[PDB]
């Protein structure tokens, strides 16, 4: 029984989920691993396949959607390629900005939610009452300088809330619902600006206003944010070893590996 | 009572709705008939605030996804941001191919969902029985030529299924199904090759395979794929004179104008 090599080791773990029991120094060649763990996977897309057939990164967006929006918030579905100006309009220069993805002269692929909805927060105070409170969940793009935990293409949750009630127990009561109803472990810390944390893993950082930059977006009132990403919260959520699995991929479908 | 100038008639064709019942010359000064158009669209915005909270691209994703999940097809979610290599892969060359949004040397904006669902045709291949089935919904990009139908950023569906099954007959069962459960009124034409209409307006392009290009994404069985947008299909179900009103948009909630 020679001992695995690395390569093999590796190749055996995109092949394994959380809940297989099996270690790996245990006599066995890797050919026979690798067959075990084969068949498993390919049962397990044959179920998924007969009973639920929902991607799970779609059906998170979708559970979430239906939680703010019964909680009284507002489906925001806003440009994702977006100007240059907005970015700069956001404290930031020329030169952090590494990790945009520039499309033309003009444009990027945003990285954030927090413009938009800031356009959005000052046009619907023309219209709405008192408070004002919308969400956006969708694609944002920033170039790694990690990767761990980061991927370039995730998806982003940020909701907000302008006018009355927005202060600090407020939007922890409100994180606290949200992540109690998904069953995810949290702690809230701070880096008022809260980080909102499992074990070591940032699931969100959120903000209680104002902030100096409001009058940029024609903000003047108080308010309240979170952005969470929605591949942070699957892999906990999944107990993945690895963020990449909860992504928008060619490799993985809910976390099982299509290269079988 | 002086004409509408032709600026100010455009200012009130953003505020109108198609159910107004609101002919413009018909005598009362401009100011009025915009400041009879800004109350009502106040007050659709307060009751979609008040009642609804859903936004209709997102809405109707949820439908169609319901629709297809429930008919056996998986749902895919794959990267938004692909290799360029896959677009030269589906017979085109860097001489159509100045509508794409490059992001680097490598990579672009996907404009169509053909090439990641074909990788899943083939990765999926040696994992699920037969007929394999699924779809994709999501974000596509496409710099325009036209762009009286045409956005630059539009969301389209793109079903598949490969193996048994794949006929004329049966692709356009599920299309006829479809857009009777949705609620609009189409044709089926041909552009085998099938386009399905609205009058004039294209819903989607159909094919039926195999086509000889196959090869390239490993897909050596008989298939049927279709390919519609969510906005051109907004756009007609709720009568909007403009597809702009059916996008992402800061200008526009559900058809109704922002800048109030
Ligand atoms: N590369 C990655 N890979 C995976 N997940 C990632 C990655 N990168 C980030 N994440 C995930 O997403 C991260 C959240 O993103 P950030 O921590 O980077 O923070 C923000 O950017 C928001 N601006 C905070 C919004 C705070 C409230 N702001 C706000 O509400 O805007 C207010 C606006 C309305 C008007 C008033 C003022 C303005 C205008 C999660 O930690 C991580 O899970
Ligand atoms: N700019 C726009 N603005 C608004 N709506 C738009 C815009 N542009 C397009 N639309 C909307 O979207 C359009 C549909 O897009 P196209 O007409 O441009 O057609 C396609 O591209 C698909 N490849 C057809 C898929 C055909 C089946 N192919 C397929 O299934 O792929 C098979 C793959 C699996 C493997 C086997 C072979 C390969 C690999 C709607 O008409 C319009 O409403
Ligand atoms: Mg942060
Ligand atoms: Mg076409």
Chains 1, 2 share one sequence.
């Not at 270690?23 to 498993?40: A, I, V």
């Not at 995730?154 to 009630?165: A, D, E, H, R």
Request: aromatic letters at 8%.
């Amino acid at each position: 029984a020679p001992a695995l090599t690395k390569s093999q080791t590796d190749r055996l773990e995109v092949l394994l989920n959380p809940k297989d029991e099996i270690s790996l120094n245990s006599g066995k060649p890797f050919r026979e691993l690798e067959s075990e763990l084969l068949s498993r996977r390919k049962k397990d897309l044959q179920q998924i396949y007969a009973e639920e057939r929902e991607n799970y990164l779609g059906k998170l967006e979708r559970e979430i959607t239906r939680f703010f929006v019964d909680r009284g918030f507002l489906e925001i579905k806003s440009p994702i390629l977006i100007p240059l100006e907005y970015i700069e309009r956001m404290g930031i220069d020329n030169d952090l900005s590494k990790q945009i993805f520039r499309v033309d002269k003009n444009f990027c692929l945003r990285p954030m939610l927090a413009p938009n909805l800031g356009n959005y927060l000052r046009k619907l105070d023309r219209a709405l009452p008192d408070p004002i409170k919308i969400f956006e969940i969708g694609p944002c793009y920033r170039k790694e300088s990690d990767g761990k935990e980061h991927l370039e293409e995730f998806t982003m949750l940020n909701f907000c809330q302008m006018g009355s009630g927005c202060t600090r127990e407020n939007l922890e009561s409100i994180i606290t619902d949200f992540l109690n109803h998904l069953g995810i472990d949290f702690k809230i810390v701070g880096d008022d600006t809260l980080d909102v944390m499992h074990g070591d893993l940032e699931l969100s950082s959120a903000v209680v206003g104002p902030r100096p930059l409001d009058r940029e977006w024609g903000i003047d009132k108080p308010w309240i944010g979170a952005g969470f990403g929605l591949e942070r919260l699957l892999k906990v959520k999944h107990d993945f070893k690895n963020i990449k699995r909860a992504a928008r991929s060619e490799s993985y479908y809910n976390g099982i590996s299509t290269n079988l």
